[PDB]
Each structure stands twice: as C-alpha cells, then as structure tokens.
Amino acid sequence: QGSTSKHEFQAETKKLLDIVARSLYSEKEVFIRELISNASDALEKLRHKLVSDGQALPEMEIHLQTNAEKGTITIQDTGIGMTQEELVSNLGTIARSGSKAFLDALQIIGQFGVGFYSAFMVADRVEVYSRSAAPGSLGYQWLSDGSGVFEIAEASGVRTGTKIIIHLKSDCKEFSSEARVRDVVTKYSNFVSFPLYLNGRRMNT
C-alpha cells in the first residue's frame, strides 16, 4: 500500500519531538544570556546617544537579583528604556511569536527580539518595568500573568532603563538560587561591555 507524501511529512517531523524538546528544555537557562545581552545593548544605545551629545554618563550597570523565597529572578539595566508604546508593541509581538522563536533557536522594535521568548518558557508571570531615557518620561509596567491577556499601567518610582521580574515556573525554581545562576552569569558577563552584578556582587572584570 502507498502512503501520501503529506502524511509522511507529518510523521517524519513528529519523530523529532523528543530530541528537539529535550534538547531545548535542557538549555532553557539561555533566557539569562538573552536578557543580559538585551540589557547591555540598551545601555550602549544610551551611552552612544549621550556621548554623541556631549552629556555626562549616569551609572551604567547591569544588575541581576535572585530571590529564593519568592522564586524570582530580576534583571535590571539603567539604559535607554522603552516608551509605553514600545513596551506594548515589543512584548506583545514576542509573546505571539513562539514558533518563530523556537525555529530561530534551532537555526522587531524595542529592547527585545524573538529570543526573549526564552523568558516566557520559564515564567508563570513576567513583569517588565521601563522608563525611557528621554527627559520627562513616565515609567510603565507591562505584565503577563499567564492568562490570555497582557496589561499596561503607569508605574512611578520606576528608574530610567528597564527592569524585568520573572516569577519562575514550578519546575524552574533553580533559577532563583544564587548558586545555580552564578555560574551562568559569570561566564556570560564576559561578553558585555558594562559592569554586571549579581545580588550586589560584581561578576565580570
């Protein structure tokens, strides 16, 4: 008996499920590199702007924190930040771009590319605070709480730049342990052009 080509293509791609999914799951600490890379790029966008306008530089640092009791990990930078519209458009787009992100990992406007989908893979809840570096900017929070619906709101006491808080999934709590995250962030912090701290400690030369 002959099978159809259509059916065969379905069967052959399904054969990859376990290999691909196990591989990506075992690598899921990549969200830390992605968000550190994004932070550094945002810092450099601001640095470039200021230097080019002859303006003194503020504190320019990347800060991560882990909180084992809350099961969170936070990444903050004091870089160029995002406007309310940029938050909404960028983070919405990434949250709808899962299959693109997965294909990209195997092979947009704002701080984040499709790779930021790695953060959603490990999160029950994602909070992104940002205040654009343009003078007089207000701070905003964009929130995914794991329902189908995102929320945007003014958030005062947000400092210029961007702060991401991830509440980790039930099988991802290791990323709220300093010990686990130290080795990941020690290696990756070699590759940024700014000072990087983890829980108040300097991680790169």
For 154, other C-beta atoms within 10 Å of its C-beta total 10
Nearest distance from residue 163's CB to its own copies, in Å? 22
Question: Which of these, 57, 87, 75, lies nearest to 185 by C-alpha position?
Answer: 75
- Residue 30 CA to residue 24 CA, distance in Å, equals 9
CB of 142 to its own copies, least distance (A): 19
Please state the closest distance from residue 96 (CB atom) to its own copies, in A. Answer: 12
Q: Which run of H or E residues covers position 75?
A: strand 72-77
* Distance in Å, CB of 175 to its own copies, minimum: 10
Strand-strand pairing, 150-154 and 139-144: antiparallel
Nearer to its own copies, 106 or 138 (CB): 106
Q: Is 199 in a helix, a strand, or coil?
A: coil
Cβ nearer to its own copies, comparing 18 with 59:
18
Residue set of the binding site for ATP: 38, 77, 90, 116
Positions that interact with its own copies (CB under 8 A): 1-6, 8-10, 12-22, 24-25, 28, 98-99, 102-103, 106-107, 121-122, 124, 146, 169-172
- Provide the pairing of β-strand 139-144 with 62-67: unpaired
**Of the candidates 106, 76, 109, 75, which has an alpha carbon nearest to the alpha carbon of residue 93?**
109
Nearer to its own copies, 28 or 47 (CB): 28
Q: Which is nearer to its own copies, 1 or 52 (CB)?
A: 1
Q: Return binding residues.
A: 38, 77, 90, 116
